[PDB]
Amino acid sequence: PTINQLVRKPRQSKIKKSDSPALNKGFNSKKKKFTDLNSPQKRGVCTRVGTMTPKKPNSALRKYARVRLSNNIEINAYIPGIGHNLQEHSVVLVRGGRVKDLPGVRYHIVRGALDTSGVDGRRQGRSLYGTKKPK
Amino acid sequence: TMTDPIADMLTRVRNANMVRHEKLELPASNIKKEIAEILKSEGFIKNVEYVEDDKQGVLRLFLKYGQNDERVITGLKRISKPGLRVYAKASEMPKVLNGLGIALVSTSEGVITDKEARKRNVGGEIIAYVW
RNA sequence: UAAGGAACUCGGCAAAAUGACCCCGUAACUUCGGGAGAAGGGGUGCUCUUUAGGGUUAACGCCCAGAAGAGCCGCAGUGAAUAGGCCCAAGCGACUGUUUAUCAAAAACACAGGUCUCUGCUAAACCGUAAGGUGAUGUAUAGGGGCUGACGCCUGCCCGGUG
RNA sequence: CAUUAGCUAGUUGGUAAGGUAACGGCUUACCAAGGCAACGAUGCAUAGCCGACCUGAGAGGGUGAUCGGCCACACUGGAACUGAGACACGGUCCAGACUCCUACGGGAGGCAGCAGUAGGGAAUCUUCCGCAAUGGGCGAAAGCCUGACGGAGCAACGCCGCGUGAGUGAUGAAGGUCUUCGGAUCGUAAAACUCUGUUAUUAGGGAAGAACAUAUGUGUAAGUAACUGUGCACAUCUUGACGGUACCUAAUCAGAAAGCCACGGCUAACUACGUGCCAGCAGCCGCGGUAAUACGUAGGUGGCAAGCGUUAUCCGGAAUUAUUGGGCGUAAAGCGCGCGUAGGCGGUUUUUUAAGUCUGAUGUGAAAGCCCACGGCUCAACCGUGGAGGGUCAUUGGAAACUGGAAAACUUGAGUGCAGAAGAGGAAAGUGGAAUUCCAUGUGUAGCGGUGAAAUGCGCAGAGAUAUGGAGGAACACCAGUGGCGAAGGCGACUUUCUGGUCUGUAACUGACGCUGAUGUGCGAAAGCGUGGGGAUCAAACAGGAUUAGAUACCCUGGUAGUCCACGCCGUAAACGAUGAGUGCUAAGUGUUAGGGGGGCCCCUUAGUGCUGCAGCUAACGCAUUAAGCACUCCGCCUGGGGAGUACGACCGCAAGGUUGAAACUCAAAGGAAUUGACGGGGACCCGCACAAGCGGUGGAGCAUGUGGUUUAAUUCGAAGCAACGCG
RNA sequence: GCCGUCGAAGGUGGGACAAAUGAUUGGGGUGAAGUCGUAACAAGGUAGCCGUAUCGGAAGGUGCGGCUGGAUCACCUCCUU
């Protein structure tokens, strides 16, 4: 635009909508209010453990878990790895990162953490997927 | 309506130079007179002729071209525009094409070039870029 | 009339409660008029100080009203009589009005507004056996009859039958 | 944040009085009606502010941990007392909510001080030592207090530095992994000899931080009658939490000291095995369906390394808000068009001013930070010094070109005057001719009408046709054209009356009076609505009759609103040149409309309207003096596709509905131009036993054969449209 | 000691705003190659699109106005060589 049009109407940049919104909100049990926190991870309770069919191009039974976080927020989280020991009423640690196939899963359950075991036979890539150094 | 007579002058030179016209005429003004004589002394145009008519006399400019019809003037750019004026200090005077082109600066010492303007250590309005 | 306050009852029937004046506040909803006194709060006695106001005027004086203070007294000061209970929501009817004098006042009848139809003027329609009238000393923007019933949005399909 | 537009009533000013350290509606009376606001009053939400930190080439963008400056707060809320200073974190009174004691009448408490506990959370530490130094309070001082502070404890939380070994040594042992079975690779890697002690262990030394204060003496100065005493000058004595801690010196040992992630492309690093669209991987492109360098594992490789990855958030890359540094013909984007207000911008000359602009000088922009230099820790991190830098800064000189202000002057811009020109420009009222429909008659006889074929339908109660006449409504053939006029929408029969705009020529007048234009205010095709008229034709819808498998459609027959008029309302269109307005410049050629001047013709020229076409622009198509080129001013608009022009709110409207206008959620595309094919019930030209003329055959029966199916002990396996089925 | 001006907390009342929840009810998005038609892209079976109104199980069709972001065809009109 012209300089005068810019002076009257300064340029407005676009706002950035962030992924993993449920990690950006805290809770205050005393005031019954939601806060803004920007947490790396959040801890929740598994209210449902099951398996989800993936998007159309792919075909594989993917394990997931419905997790109610520390907030009053109920999200769906992926379970990386082969074997998992999670049933209902399991405390998990949930990080960011979505699954492309699974529609409605925007988070990942951290393996090898509070009440979540690692992958039994993992030998290369043990930082991810939990599990300690064999021998 | 007409808002920038100087920008009209540079565009007249730009348009005539593009089609390699040997000469052009434009309504004259004191500041437009000086810019023509700055371009003459800097070797961008051949000659400046100022003809006295009754009203706003005529400025005749004879453009210069080189051996293989090489347009001596490559481009013209109005810097200070009526919608947004540009003023520069002597310390931040711009160097057009690393000194291979002149910037027309109107200072308290008259309409001069950017090279010796740093010599007088004065600033003014950056009229146009000629390279 | 102790305490309770619709537990009575078919139903708050009856009774109780508000009520005057002054000041402040008043929502949804609306056809923009209203709703509305909506709701909901506060004051009113007496004496003194003070001192605006305009009314008749020659002025005294006579009337009728204001404001600010300082007191006084009772349980209570529109100290008696007279003077709206209110709010939320459904039907029904637009409304003011009129009806069974003497068991029914309403949701029934009117209504303003619509529509259909008839009627050309000795009009149609009506009272009379007729003469005479009404309509009207009116003339299709008038008159009679049917139906519906402010306003807003609308009013589908069927002409076999019957008129 | 405008989907927060009107906010206040001590409010705003004045006059008095009071009280405040002090001015002041600070408070109170009385006057007046004032005050702020699209330059965003008010309201809502959010937030301590800054030096500074992160990022970026810069412009910018994000942030406000530790350190320093300011502010505010001390369980929540009011108030004052003492005091120089408080309306007071470890002070007082009251109220409240809690927690505790009580002989029930009454009492006590406040870690957002340092530690520490419970709780919340993904997440953040010792209930330590000392006043040895620096600072603070009090005291003449010695001293006392100091959870300030100086130090220790814990945490890879970060930055920096050093390690975990080196020289020679077969890139051959033995072992893994592949293998083309020959070998290759781990690999100088390993033994193997020498070698060091950074580290570690033990066993001896062992700083600085210490300057003091006081006390003691010694002189000096001032004041002294004099002395004490005080200030100053000197030298003596003293003391350390850290701490026997840095650090150094001897022996001793390669011994006690590496892991994490990747290896499909972006992007450095490939093989084998397992699995087989499963298990699983994934930031995107995507991988995985018996031969994955993409999944899991094993070797090897590569990147880093006491760290390595993942997640969370910011900047960059992103020119993806484009001031630097983008666009709006077809990709997103020019408001449907005028009239116009604020604002923004503005023709030439002279004089002046100096607000901007430029150039100095002062004061300040604290310190700590960034950068540069220098010095000290063995280097570095770190520390300390000196510069530099940092402002829309304030005061004060100087310059006068430009922008701004003031005073003069000028016509080219813009307007007015005069002489001409054309026009379906608009409004009102009249006047016509052709045609359609209907009606009345005369003639007239069996059909009319319509389709691809029909039929519904109109007729025999005389239709259609033909002739005459009448009634009524609507529109104006020929003229008529890349013609004209209008801002756009739009405007065609003729006449008259009002009335708008435009063009040409002249140069008589004014001397910049101009452009654009948010809000605003008007106009604005059709359709639609209200009221009252009118109603010929055509007709949404509605009825039929057909076609189709169905046909609430195209075809036919009728037919209502509407189509017409007068008032209002509506305010939308592919309202398009899909192209904002103004100004100037930049090759040509050839038309047409309306004028002018020169020599029917030629030349020149002004304003429109067209078609080719240069430079130039564009992704291409294309535009091109009627730009989409080159420039300047102003406004409107856009920031991936859906959700969606949808909520919701507001405003407008009788209604239909119009304007403004999101989000949750979802995908990695959506889209423009052009290219190659393929498809067209999509046409023109040709060919072909394709059609026609045909002579001249099957599908009915019995048998044979091959199949399918059934059945069987098995009825062996293949062929399944043309191109399997008397096929192998 | 009394009372009186201000006065926190509290009480009463009518409004404003914001979240949550509510029988039931609307459109959207996704999915399993579920059923009826075939509306647009080829003149897409009847050019399309825009505005508008009225009807229809549904895409839509039709009525009026406008555009080419339409074929072929009959030719304009210029250009053109």
Check whether residue B69 and residue B112 sit in a common domain: no
In whole angstroms, give the CA distance from residue A123 to residue A111: 14
**Encoding tokens for residue A72?**
């009053």
Residue carrying the six token digits 């310390």? B91
Check whether residue B21 and residue B42 sit in a common domain: yes
Spatial CA neighbour of A76 closest among A56, A92, A61: A92
Sign of CA dihedral B93, B95, B99, B102: negative
DSSP state of A106: -
Say how many CA atoms lie within 13 Å of A28 toward its Cβ. Answer: 8
Q: What is the resolution of this structure in A?
A: 2.6
From the CB of residue B44, how many other CB atoms can be counted at a distance below 10 Å?
A: 23
Closest alpha carbon within chain A to B82: A3
Check whether residue B56 and residue B78 sit in a common domain: no
Check whether residue B46 and residue B8 sit in a common domain: yes
Convert chain B into a string of H (helix), E (strand) and C (coil): CCCCHHHHHHHHHHHHHHCCCCEEEEECCHHHHHHHHHHHHCCCEEEEEEECCCCCCEEEEEECECCCCCECCCCEEECCECCECCEECCCCCCCHHHHCCEEEEEECCEEEEHHHHHHHCCCEEEEEEEC
Reading phi first (left if > 0) and then psi (alpha if -120 to 50, else beta), residue A20 is in left
From the CB of residue B92, how many other CB atoms can be counted at a distance below 10 Å?
A: 7
From the CB of residue A78, how many other CB atoms can be counted at a distance below 10 Å?
A: 21
Check whether residue B54 and residue B78 sit in a common domain: no
Number of domains in chain B: 2
Q: How many residues does chain B have?
A: 131
Check whether residue B64 and residue B7 sit in a common domain: yes
Chain B contact present for A3, CB below 8 A = yes
Q: Which residues of B69-83 are buried (b: 16+ CB within 10 A; e: fewer)?
A: eeeebeebebbbeee
Q: Judge whether A66 and A88 are in contact, CB under 8 Å.
A: no
B39: which residues sit within 8 A by CB, 6+ positions away? B45, B48, B73, B130
Q: Which of B51, B73, B95 is the last residue of a domain?
A: B73
Check whether residue B54 and residue B103 sit in a common domain: no
In whole angstroms, give the CA distance from residue B102 to residue B122: 16
CA atom of A35 to C1′ atom of D70, Å:
29
Q: Which domain holds residue B19?
A: 1-73
Check whether residue B34 and residue B87 sit in a common domain: no
Check whether residue B53 and residue B14 sit in a common domain: yes
Chain A from 18 to 37: CB within 8 A of any B CB? none
In whole angstroms, give the CA distance from residue B4 to residue B32: 11
Q: Which of B73, B88, B107 is the last residue of a domain?
A: B73
Residues of chain A contacting B82 with CB distance shorter than 8 Å? none
Check whether residue B3 and residue B66 sit in a common domain: yes
* Biggest distance spanned by C-alpha atoms of chain B: 43
Q: Which of B31, B51, B73 is the last residue of a domain?
A: B73
Reading phi first (left if > 0) and then psi (alpha if -120 to 50, else beta), residue A6 is in alpha
Check whether residue B78 and residue B67 sit in a common domain: no
Q: Judge whether A111 and A119 are in contact, CB under 8 Å.
A: yes
Q: Judge whether B38 and B45 are in contact, CB under 8 Å.
A: no
CA atom of A41 to C1′ atom of D383, Å:
39
Quick one: which H or E segment has residue A27?
strand A25-28
Q: Judge whether B47 and B62 are in contact, CB under 8 Å.
A: yes
DSSP strand pairing (B45-51 vs B110-113): unpaired
**Encoding tokens for residue B3?**
């808002």
Breaks in chain B after (C-N > 2.5 angstroms): none
